[PDB]
């Protein structure tokens, strides 16, 4: 039990520790002894040292102080008869200024950790509200207090200017965060939050991580959620990042094993991704392969044949039912349209009258029309001539068509990214410069452990200097 | 008034399209009856002999 | 003949790496496998000759990842995995120890809905010495395994070193750069024993390499190497050579005490405000407060003691006598709390001039205590005031001498005297003898002059305030005289 | 609220004159045939589903013969060489 005289001599010094190491070092020591401490030891006399951290001058030490500090809270199995208002009153207040922290790695641990804060507040008010009626606050009060207090933070880390900590929020725990805003508020606020994060039209893997994590608030919204996230995620279809259409497939997937999508949209979005099944992106194509089986699974055997199978027919190549197993749908998955065919229709300035000129000569291929002249614009007869002299078999150019709809939207969306391109100009090249900074150099001629690591590097490069000066004009 | 309207229009455009549904399920049962010819003997047989194949195969295989 | 550096910590900018290309044969599982998992022949190893790989760029630290995963877009590949992207990732120069790592996984399709990692490498950020990444760097690809970013790392994408190629490649990079000597004729040969060498590596091994790069920084065409430095780093530790009085140094010697400071917050919490009005003690509670009101003036509360009366501070307000209690639970330097205490201040019901005195004393210094007793003790006669100017000519000792040095809730202590005094002549008379009597006090004049000079502008000031007053009043200022 | 209890609301413009009451009993019996149908196809289904099995039972087999006859390749293919370089290892030794 001596364990507490030991804890004496080390928060003795967390006020005055001068080095970024030593600072690291107590961390980990609490961290290592918070298991083996007592509940009242590490509410009292622990947890005052961690809130200090938290304003420290380093911003590592901020970071690691508040995710011991979450870590560190979690072990409180029992509230002191004193402590009950910690979190409202003195945790909460005093890391809620880490959540606009300048130093993004503070705020980046922010999001990692307040999906974790929260639940441990709310689980310390359960605890409470358990020692008042066996002791036996008004607990509707000060739930709303916590929420209230909560969602002010995420939307305040939905709102930072570095993505990063959207993007964070998003991977660790925006599903879990919505019970802070109840059924109603986190669509009001939460949601339309999130749907805002498809507006970057710069930052793919943003877009990315909300099609990751909205199936959870979608989830948690339920059937509201749906007219209001189903024009997006056939945004996210059309995206001008490949991945982010994987994502947006992967996200469509889920969506339907929960049944969120109603019955109509399902058919219709089966309608929009069955073309996939030929893309060149075999991320693509096994992702509508994913999101397909999954809907055979979800509906009838009836409808998988008189609703589904029409809309995958075209791309399979035995109308098999028992397409529900991902096995046997890649089995019958025609050749896709090979990638080199794809991106010359893609990439071209004008890609509208390509598909004009292919439907034609889809209608004068089955039938519909009996010749079919030249295009008229020698720019599509250029196209043309490249796609068919790179080998365009005419299946290549039914599933073209079939993909029709998603490479004009998609060839829209990339050019509208590039008209953004101006923006970033300069970072696109190879360097980056401290000019625009006015970050102060540092040199040495060569004609603490940091500071000792440095004497050594000055004279590794001194020899290495010497090294090749020497030899060289000794040759 | 205007939410009377509404809802009307609602259950119109809800009894076409179930009713067109009814049309597809008709039209695919003008199909299924057809598919009903596929003999069931050949084909399973036809996976007896590739089952003997198969069988030859994998022996070799472990040969 | 310079080197120019930076410190890791000073480069407040997002690190930055380019995927490269991908190098080396694909090692193809033999169809046995295809066999006992049939869901193998739809992978990207066995479609195509290239598949559209992608790599994933974790930075770690200690066995932790500092940040999200970074991830390269969407690249066709036909012939060659090669990527041509920056990934800016997700963490800063200053955020980044000297055990900083990142760990390149390349991932590959496996049917739908799941990756498979084709390899992975972790390569240090910081070299030998604490410098950074510095250029062009090919890292050895573990197969089939996630890159591991635990220190060690099991899957590091360099050496020290003990093979050909990885001593080999580094002498033929350092040749390009020039560092090494150039001779044109052992060049010609030299490089032809490395492309055996290498050629039958790529024969009798199958790794396969993943070159990445790092931005070399610039400034006024300067390239400047960041060094792993710390804020704080730069000086050494002030420690005493020898000592003779302090024999056991206490690292916490004037420091705030924390735990202390926790128990004040929760314990008096101002949150309260709105329930207080409603709330009120009870039996048990009545008594024990009546209890605490009754201590003397100079029973200093005990914090169980304090807490009750800052519990139902809206409860004592009705009480002449417990302010005297409340101002000594308020701490003066918590803006929080002393908002508040000003407030419950200015409702409870006032406090009679014997407990006015007190307010007075040393301890209370916050200037709106201390008018505040002001504005008590004017409600009292001059009568009593002429006792009590002995020792309130004492309490001018706790006004703040600033006030006085340039005064040549309405009124400080001091003004208050020299007011009164005006308004009746027994206390000018008295006030005159017993701040004379502290300018002409030789040792204040030397133990403590700045309360000798406060009397001796205490002085002037009832020398200026009397020649202000009415002319009955001005004949005052003559009779001292 | 009045209205909807009543179901004799029609449209103010006058587009139609059958009551909303009218059109929700066809609904219901649309509905009921809709049932019927899907009972129908689904008779149906079970014979397709049963030879469709067997379709895919002989494109699996058929998918593991050209897998099981490339084995065989792939293991000759193995084993012709390791059996050049051993004779030629022997006549090395």
Same mark, same amino acid.
């Given at each position: 039990?001596?364990?507490?005289?030991?804890?004496?001599?080390?928060?003795?010094?967390?006020?005055?520790?001068?080095?970024?190491?030593?600072?690291?070092?107590?961390?980990?020591?609490?961290?290592?002894?918070?298991?083996?401490?007592?509940?009242?030891?590490?509410?009292?006399?622990?947890?005052?040292?961690?809130?200090?951290?938290?304003?420290?001058?380093?911003?590592?030490?901020?970071?690691?102080?508040?995710?011991?500090?979450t870590k560190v809270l979690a072990l409180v199995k029992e509230v002191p008869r004193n402590d009950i208002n910690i979190y409202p009153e003195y945790i909460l207040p005093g890391i809620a200024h880490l959540a606009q922290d300048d130093a993004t790695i503070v705020r980046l641990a922010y999001a990692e950790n307040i999906a974790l804060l929260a639940e441990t507040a709310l689980r310390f008010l359960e605890l409470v509200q358990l020692k008042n009626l066996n002791m036996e606050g008004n607990y509707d009060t000060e739930l709303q207090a916590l929420h209230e207090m909560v969602q002010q933070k995420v939307v305040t880390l939905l709102s930072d200017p570095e993505n990063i900590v959207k993007q964070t929020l998003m991977e660790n725990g925006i599903t879990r965060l919505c019970v802070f805003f109840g059924r109603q508020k986190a669509n009001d606020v939460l949601l339309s939050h999130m749907i805002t994060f498809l507006n970057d039209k710069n930052d793919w893997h943003?877009?990315?991580?909300?099609?990751?994590?909205?199936?959870?608030?979608?989830?948690?919204?339920?059937?509201?959620?749906?007219?209001?996230?189903?024009?997006?995620?056939?945004?996210?279809?059309?995206?001008?990042?490949?991945?982010?259409?994987?994502?947006?497939?992967?996200?469509?997937?889920?969506?339907?094993?929960?049944?969120?999508?109603?019955?109509?949209? *399902?058919?219709?979005?089966?309608?929009?991704?069955?073309?996939?099944?030929?893309?060149?992106?075999?991320?693509?194509?096994?992702?509508?392969?994913?999101?397909?089986?999954?809907?055979?699974?979800?509906?009838?055997?009836?409808?998988?044949?008189?609703?589904?199978?029409?809309?995958?027919?075209?791309?399979?190549?035995?109308?098999?039912?028992?397409?529900?197993?991902?096995?046997?749908?890649?089995?019958?998955?025609?050749?896709?349209?090979?990638?080199?065919?794809?991106?010359?229709?893609?990439?071209?300035?004008?890609?509208?009258?390509?598909?004009?000129?292919?439907?034609?000569?889809?209608?004068?291929?089955?039938?519909?029309?009996?010749?079919?002249?030249?295009?008229?614009?020698?720019?599509?007869?250029?196209?043309?001539?490249?796609?068919?002299?790179?080998?365009?078999?005419?299946?290549?150019?039914?599933?073209?068509?079939?993909?029709?709809?998603?490479?004009?939207?998609?060839?829209?969306?990339?050019?509208?990214?590039?008209?953004?391109?101006?923006?970033?100009?300069?970072?696109?090249?190879?360097?980056?410069?401290?000019?625009?900074?006015?970050?102060?150099?540092?040199?040495?001629?060569?004609?603490?452990?940091?500071?000792?690591?440095?004497?050594?590097?000055?004279?590794?490069?001194?020899?290495?200097?010497?090294?090749?000066?020497?030899?060289?004009?000794?040759? | 008034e205007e939410c009377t309207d509404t809802l009307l229009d609602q259950l119109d455009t809800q009894l076409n399209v179930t009713e067109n549904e009814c049309q597809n399920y008709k039209r695919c049962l003008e199909i299924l009856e057809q598919m009903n010819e596929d003999d069931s003997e050949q084909l399973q047989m036809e996976l007896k002999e590739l089952a003997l194949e198969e069988e030859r195969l994998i022996q070799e295989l472990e040969d | 003949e310079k080197f120019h550096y930076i410190y890791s910590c000073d480069l407040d900018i997002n690190v930055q790496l380019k995927i490269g290309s991908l190098e080396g044969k694909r090692e193809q599982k033999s169809y046995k496998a295809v066999l006992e998992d049939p869901m193998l022949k739809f992978s990207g190893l066995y479609q195509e000759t290239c598949s559209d790989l992608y790599v994933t760029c974790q930075v770690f630290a200690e066995g932790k990842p500092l940040a999200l995963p970074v991830r390269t877009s969407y690249k066709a590949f036909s012939t060659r995995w090669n990527w041509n992207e920056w990934l800016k990732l997700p963490v800063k120069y200053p955020d980044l120890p000297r055990n900083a790592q990142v760990a390149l996984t390349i991932w590959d *399709?496996?049917?739908?809905?799941?990756?498979?990692?084709?390899?992975?490498?972790?390569?240090?950020?910081?070299?030998?010495?604490?410098?950074?990444?510095?250029?062009?760097?090919?890292?050895?690809?573990?197969?089939?395994?996630?890159?591991?970013?635990?220190?060690?790392?099991?899957?590091?994408?360099?050496?020290?070193?003990?093979?050909?190629?990885?001593?080999?490649?580094?002498?033929?990079?350092?040749?390009?750069?020039?560092?090494?000597?150039?001779?044109?004729?052992?060049?010609?040969?030299?490089?032809?024993?490395?492309?055996?060498?290498?050629?039958?590596?790529?024969?009798?091994?199958?790794?396969?390499?993943?070159?990445?790069?790092?931005?070399?920084?610039?400034?006024?065409?300067?390239?400047?190497?960041?060094?792993?430095?710390?804020?704080?780093?730069?000086?050494?530790?002030?420690?005493?050579?020898?000592?003779?009085?302090?024999?056991?140094?206490?690292?916490?010697?004037?420091?705030?005490?924390?735990?202390?400071?926790?128990?004040?917050?929760?314990?008096?919490?101002?949150?309260?405000?709105?329930?207080?009005?409603?709330?009120?003690?009870?039996?048990?509670?009545?008594?024990?407060?009546?209890?605490?009101?009754?201590?003397?003036?100079?029973?200093?509360?005990?914090?169980?003691?304090?807490?009750?009366?800052?519990?139902?501070?809206?409860?004592?307000?009705?009480?002449?006598?417990?302010?005297?209690?409340?101002?000594?639970?308020?701490?003066?330097?918590?803006?929080?709390?002393?908002?508040?205490?000003?407030?419950?201040?200015?409702?409870?019901?006032?406090?009679?001039?014997?407990?006015?005195?007190?307010?007075?004393?040393?301890?209370?210094?916050?200037p709106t205590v201390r008018r505040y007793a002001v504005a008590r003790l004017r409600q009292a006669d001059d009568e009593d005031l002429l006792m009590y100017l002995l020792q309130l000519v004492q309490a001018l000792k706790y006004e703040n001498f600033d006030d006085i040095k340039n005064g040549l809730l309405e009124q400080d202590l001091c003004t208050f005297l020299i007011s009164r005094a005006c308004k009746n002549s027994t206390l000018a008379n008295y006030l005159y003898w017993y701040v004379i009597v502290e300018c002409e006090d030789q040792d204040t004049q030397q133990r403590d002059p700045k309360t000798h000079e406060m009397y001796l502008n205490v002085m002037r000031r009832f020398s200026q305030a009397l020649l202000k007053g009415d002319k009955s009043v001005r004949v005052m200022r003559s009779l001292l005289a | 609220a009045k209205c909807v209890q009543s179901g004799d609301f029609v449209y103010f413009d006058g587009r139609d004159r059958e009551r909303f009451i009218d059109k929700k009993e066809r609904l219901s019996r649309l509905k009921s045939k809709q049932e019927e149908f899907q009972k129908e196809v689904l008779k149906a289904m079970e014979g397709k589903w049963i030879t469709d099995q067997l379709r895919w039972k002989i494109m699996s087999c058929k998918m593991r013969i050209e897998q099981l006859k490339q084995t065989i390749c792939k293991g000759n293919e193995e084993m012709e060489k390791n059996s050049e370089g051993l004779l030629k290892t022997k006549e090395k030794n």
């Open positions: 039990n001596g364990l507490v005289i030991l804890v004496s001599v080390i928060t003795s010094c967390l006020q005055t520790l001068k080095y970024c190491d030593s600072k690291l070092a107590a961390l980990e020591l609490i961290l290592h002894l918070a298991p083996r401490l007592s509940v009242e030891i590490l509410l009292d006399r622990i947890t005052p040292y961690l809130l200090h951290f938290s304003n420290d001058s380093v911003p590592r030490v901020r970071a690691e102080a508040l995710r011991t500090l943003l877009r990315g991580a909300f099609f990751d994590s909205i199936v959870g608030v979608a989830a948690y919204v339920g059937w509201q959620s749906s007219s209001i996230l189903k024009p997006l995620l056939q945004q996210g279809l059309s995206d001008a990042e490949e991945f982010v259409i994987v994502k947006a497939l992967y996200a469509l997937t889920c969506m339907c094993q929960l049944g969120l999508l109603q019955k109509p949209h *399902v058919y219709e979005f089966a309608s929009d991704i069955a073309p996939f099944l030929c893309h060149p992106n075999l991320w693509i194509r096994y992702g509508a392969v994913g999101f397909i089986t999954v809907v055979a699974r979800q509906i009838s055997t009836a409808d998988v044949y008189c609703k589904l199978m029409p809309y995958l027919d075209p791309y399979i190549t035995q109308p098999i039912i028992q397409i529900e197993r991902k096995l046997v749908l890649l089995s019958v998955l025609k050749e896709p349209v090979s990638r080199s065919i794809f991106d010359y229709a893609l990439r071209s300035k004008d890609i509208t009258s390509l598909f004009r000129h292919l439907h034609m000569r889809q209608k004068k291929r089955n039938g519909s029309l009996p010749d079919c002249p030249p295009p008229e614009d020698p720019a599509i007869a250029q196209l043309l001539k490249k796609l068919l002299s790179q080998g365009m078999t005419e299946e290549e150019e039914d599933k073209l068509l079939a993909l029709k709809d998603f490479m004009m939207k998609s060839n829209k969306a990339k050019a509208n990214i590039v008209d953004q391109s101006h923006l970033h100009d300069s970072s696109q090249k190879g360097v980056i410069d401290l000019a625009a900074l006015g970050i102060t150099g540092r040199q040495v001629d060569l004609v603490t452990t940091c500071k000792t690591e440095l004497q050594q590097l000055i004279q590794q490069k001194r020899e290495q200097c010497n090294a090749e000066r020497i030899a060289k004009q000794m040759m | - | *399709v496996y049917g739908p809905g799941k990756a498979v990692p084709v390899g992975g490498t972790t390569v240090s950020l910081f070299g030998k010495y604490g410098m950074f990444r510095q250029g062009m760097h090919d890292l050895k690809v573990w197969p089939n395994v996630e890159a591991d970013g635990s220190e060690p790392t099991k899957t590091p994408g360099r050496t020290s070193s003990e093979d050909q190629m990885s001593r080999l490649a580094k002498l033929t990079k350092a040749h390009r750069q020039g560092h090494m000597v150039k001779v044109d004729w052992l060049d010609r040969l030299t490089f032809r024993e490395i492309e055996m060498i290498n050629e039958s590596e790529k024969r009798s091994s199958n790794f396969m390499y993943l070159m990445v790069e790092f931005r070399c920084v610039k400034c006024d065409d300067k390239e400047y190497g960041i060094v792993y430095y710390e804020k704080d780093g730069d000086e050494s530790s002030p420690i005493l050579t020898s000592f003779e009085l302090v024999k056991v140094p206490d690292p916490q010697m004037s420091m705030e005490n924390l735990v202390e400071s926790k128990h004040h917050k929760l314990a008096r919490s101002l949150r309260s405000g709105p329930s207080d009005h409603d709330l009120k003690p009870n039996a048990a509670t009545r008594d024990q407060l009546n209890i605490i009101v009754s201590y003397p003036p100079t029973k200093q509360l005990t914090y169980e003691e304090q807490d009750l009366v800052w519990k139902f501070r809206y409860y004592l307000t009705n009480q002449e006598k417990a302010l005297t209690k409340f101002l000594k639970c308020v701490n003066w330097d918590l803006p929080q709390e002393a908002k508040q205490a000003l407030e419950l201040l200015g409702k409870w019901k006032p406090m009679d001039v014997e407990d006015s005195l007190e307010l007075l004393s040393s301890h209370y210094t916050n | -």
